[PDB]
Symmetry: D2
Subunit: 294 residues, 4 copies
Amino acid sequence: MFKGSIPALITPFTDNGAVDEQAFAAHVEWQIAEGSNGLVPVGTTGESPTLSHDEHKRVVELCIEVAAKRVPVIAGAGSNNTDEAIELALHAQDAGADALLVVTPYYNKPTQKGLFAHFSAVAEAVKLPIVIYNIPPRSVVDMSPETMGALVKAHKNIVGVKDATGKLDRVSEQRISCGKDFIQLSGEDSTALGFNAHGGVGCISVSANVAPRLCSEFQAAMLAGDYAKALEYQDRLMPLHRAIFMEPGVCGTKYALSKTRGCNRKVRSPLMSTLEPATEAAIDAALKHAGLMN
Amino acid sequence: MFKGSIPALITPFTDNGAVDEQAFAAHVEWQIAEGSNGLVPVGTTGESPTLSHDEHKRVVELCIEVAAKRVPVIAGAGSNNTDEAIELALHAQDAGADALLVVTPYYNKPTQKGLFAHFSAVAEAVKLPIVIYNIPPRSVVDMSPETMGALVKAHKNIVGVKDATGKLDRVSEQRISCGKDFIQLSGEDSTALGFNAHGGVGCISVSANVAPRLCSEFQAAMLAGDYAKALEYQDRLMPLHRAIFMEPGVCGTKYALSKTRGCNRKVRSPLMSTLEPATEAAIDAALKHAGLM
Amino acid sequence: MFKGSIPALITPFTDNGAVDEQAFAAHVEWQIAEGSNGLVPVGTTGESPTLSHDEHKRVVELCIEVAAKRVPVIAGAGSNNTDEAIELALHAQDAGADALLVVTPYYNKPTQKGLFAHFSAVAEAVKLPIVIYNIPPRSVVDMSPETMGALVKAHKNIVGVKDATGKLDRVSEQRISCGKDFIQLSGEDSTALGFNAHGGVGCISVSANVAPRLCSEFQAAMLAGDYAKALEYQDRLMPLHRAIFMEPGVCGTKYALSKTRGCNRKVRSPLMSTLEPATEAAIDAALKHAGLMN
Amino acid sequence: MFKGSIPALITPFTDNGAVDEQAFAAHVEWQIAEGSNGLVPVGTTGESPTLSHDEHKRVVELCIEVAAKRVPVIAGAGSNNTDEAIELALHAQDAGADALLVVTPYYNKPTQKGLFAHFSAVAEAVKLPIVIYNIPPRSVVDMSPETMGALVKAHKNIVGVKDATGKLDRVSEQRISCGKDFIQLSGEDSTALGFNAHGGVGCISVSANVAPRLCSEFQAAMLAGDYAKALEYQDRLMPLHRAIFMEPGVCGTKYALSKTRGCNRKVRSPLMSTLEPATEAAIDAALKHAGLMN
C-alpha cells in the first residue's frame, strides 16, 4: 500500500564522507514516529549517484531493518544501464524491500522503445511492484503516457509512477492510459497539492525529510478530501518547498536538518557541503515560518 | 465578481471572413444560459490578432450589449504596444466593460521593469479592474511573482491574473507575493483542477466555448471544495481539453462547435479553417466521451 | 543583390517619443558612408511593434529616399495578421522598396501549414523578393526547412531567409531543402561568422547600427574567403555583440550610439529608455575593446 | 597534439553483448589508416554508460595498445561521482593515455561551484591534460564560460573543451574567458564547420566512425583555412550527420557500419539494436550520397 507522505530519505555522511549508519537509522526512526507513510532509501535525494553498489545495498538493508515492516520500503534501484538496474532490483527484493523505485535512464537518451525495453527487463527480473520514476528535468527523456500505459498492460508488477514532470495534465493523461487504479505519486513537493487533486495518492518527498509531521498531515488532509485544509498546509510549507531547491535539494535539506536536528551537512562531490548566503537565509526563514525554528 | 468558468469567447466569422454578429450574439446568449460566470470577448481565442481596431471594438460592444449586466464582461485589451493597449482599455471602459484582460507584451521581449511600466501605464489610464494575462508560451517573457506583487501594491485596480504558465507552484508563489485576495484564474483548461487546489478561483477557458454547462459545474464543484466531484468532471472533460489543443485551440474549438452546434469553422490567416484527420477524430471521440455527441 | 552587412536600422525618437526624421536620415547616410551593404528599415530593431501604420510607412519612405538606390532597401513588413502583412508589403512595394522582410507570425502560434498559407498569401500579393524572418526566440513557432523549401518551390519571389534560430545546422538543412542559391542571412550577430561558413552570404544585423565599418569589413573578409581575418574581427566585436543583448538589443544599441554619436536613448513602451548599470558598464568596456571609444 | 578529426569510438559487441575486442582493434586500426588524428575510447558513443568498470578499463587499455603512440588517445574518464571519475582518471593515466575526456556530471545537477570542485579534483589527481566535455543536452547542467575560465586559470592541465552546447557564440565566449590557446573541439558533427570558423581546432566526432577519411579531409581543409572546400565536404556529409542522429547516434552509427563494413549492430539496453525503417532508409541514402555505398 503506497500512499501518503513518503520521504526520499537523505543518506547522512560522517565528516570523512562515510555513510553514517547510526544517523541514518535515527532519521528513519524519527520519520516513522512523525507519521511518514513509507520510505525510499537511496533515491536521488539519498545521493544514489555517489554511492557504490555496496553502499547502496547496505543502506537499503539498514532501512528495511529499522523500518521492521511498520511502513513500506520502496527501494531505489535506478540506473541508466539496464543490467545494473536489474542487479540493484534483485538485491532489494532479496533484502526484503516492499517495492522498487526505478528511474528513467539518464544521460544516454534512449527512445520510447528503449524505455519500454528497460522497464520490461526490470519487471521481468523481479516479482516486486515497481514504481516508474519519470523525471525529464534530470533524465532529459520523458516517458510518454502511451509508453507508460503499454508497460502497465504488459507487466502486472508495474504499479505506479513517481511523476516529476511538473505537468499536472500528465496525471490526467496517465489516468487514461494506465487506469484510475495506477498509483500516481508526486515527484515534486511544491505541486503535490495539485497533483493529488488530479488523482495522485501521495508524494515521494524531499521536504518530508525536514518536516515529516507537517507533510504527513498535509497528505492526510488531501486523502480525506479536505483541500481547504491542504491549502493551509501549503501556506505553511511552500516557503520550505521552494527554499530547499534554490540549490540542489539534497544540500538544502541537509542544511535545514543541520539547523533543526544537528545533522551533518556533508555531501559527496559534485554536490557541495556549502550553500549561498541567500539560500541559507531563505531556508532559515522557511523553517521559522513552519514553526520548526524560533 | 471574477470567478468560476469564464469563456474566452470565439469570434465566429462568415465564409468570407467577416465577423458574424448574429452567430456571436447567439453564442454569448447560450454561454449565459448554460451557466458561464463571466465573458472574455476578443482574447486570444477570440482571434484578437486578426481583428481590426473597429472589429475589436464592435465585438466588445456587442458582447456588453448581449450580456446586459447578467455576468461580468472582461474585455480583451492586449497589445505589445503600450499606447495601443491604453487605446483598447479606454474604449472598453467607455463601452461599459466590467474589467480588462491585458496580455504581457509578446514578440518585443521587454524586461521585468518594462512589464511593470506597461501594466502601470494601463492601470493609471483607466478606472476598471485589470487582470494580467501572463502567458510565456505565447509571449516568451514571463512576469515574475515579484513584478506581479509590485504591480498589485502600486495599483489598486490590478486585481488578478490569468495565469497560463502551466506551473502550479506559481499560484503558491503569487499567493505569497500578491496576497490571498489576489484573484488567480487558470489560463489553461487541462490544469484548471490543480490550479484551484493551489488557490485559484476560476479559469478563463477555451473549452467552455464547447461545454459551458460542464465547465461551469466543474468550477462550481471546486469553489465548493468538492474536489472528488471536480475529478469526475476532469475524467469527462480531459479528452476534450487535450483534443482541442492538438492544433491551435481556436481551430479545435470551432471544429467541435461545427459538430455540436453547426458553427462556421472559418478563421483568419495565419490560422487555418482545417485540421488534421487525427485531430478531428480525437475531437469527435472526446465529444462522445463528454456526452456532447 | 542581398549580401554582407545589412543593418536592421534603429528608429530614433525625440525626447517626446516622436519619430526623429532628421536623426534617422543622418543614421542612414552614415551607414551607407561606412560601408553597409543594404538597409532594413522598421524591422524589430526599428521598433516596428510600437510604430503606427503612418509612422511605419513614413520611415520606409524616408529610408528609400535617403538611400537613393545606392544600396538595397529591404523593408520590414511583418505582422501576425496576414491581411496586415499584405497591406504593409504593398505599401513598401509602391514606395519603391527593393525587397521585403517578413517575420513568422508571433503570439498566435500557427501550424506549419498556417506558416505556408501566410507566406504564400504575401508572396502572391506582391512582385518584390521576400526574405523570410524565422525567429523562434520571439515568435515561438519555427519554420522547418521542409516548409521553407515548399515555399521556395511554390513562389519564385521567396528568395531568402533571415535565420535567427541560432542553430547553424539549419543553414546546412536549408541548403538542401531550398538550394544553394537560396539567400541565407544571419539573424544573429554573434554567430554570423559560423553562419557564413555554413553557406550564409551576410547578416541582417543589430551591431552594424553601432559599428558599420567594422561589421562591413568582417562580412567582406568572409565573402573573400578570409576566415582568419574574419575571426580577428570576431575577437574585436564579440564583446559588443554580447553586451548589446544583455537587455533588449534596441536599448543596448541606443545606449552605445548615445556615447559614440550623441543619439537619443528614447524608446517606446514597453521598451525602457535605460539599461541596468552592469549592462552599461559592459557596453562601455565592449566599445573600448572595439576601438570605438577610449 | 589535440586537433583535427578525433572519433568517439564505438565499442563493438558480439551477438551475446560481450565487448568484441577483435572488432574494436580492427576499427581502431582502420580509423588510423583512414587519417583520424586522435582516438576517444569509451566516450558516450563508446557506450560508456553500459560498460562495467572492468570493460571500461580493458577497452581503454586495448585502444592504447593498438594505437601504439601513432595518434593521441584521449580516454573517456567521465562520471557524475567525483571519486569514480578520479579512479577512472588514475587508471587511464597509468594505462598510458595521452589525455582524458571528462564529462560534466549528469543527473545529479550540481551548481557551478560543484562543477568547479569536480573538475578541480580530477585535475589535481593526474598530470595528464584534461578536456572538459560540456554537454547540456545530456547532462542538463551547463558549464559557463566563467567557470571554465576559472578552471583553466587554476589548473595548467585543464587544456580544452569538447563543446556540445550547439551554441557557437560559446566558442567566442570561451576564447575570452579561457584564452585563444585553449583547445576547443566540437562535440557536434553537424556544426563542426561553424565551430572551427569561431576558433575551434577539431571535432570529437560520431560521424568519423563511419567516414573517417572524409571527416579527416574536412578538418584538414579548415586547418588550412580553406572554408570553401570545407563547405564542399559539408555538402557531402550533412545527410549522414543528420541521419545517424534521427535515433540515438550510437545506433545510427552501428547501423551505418553494419552496411559498409559488416559491423555488429548489437548495443546494450536501454539502447536498441533496431531502428525504424525510415531511419535505415535515410542512413542508406546518406551513405550513397557520401560515396560510401552504391
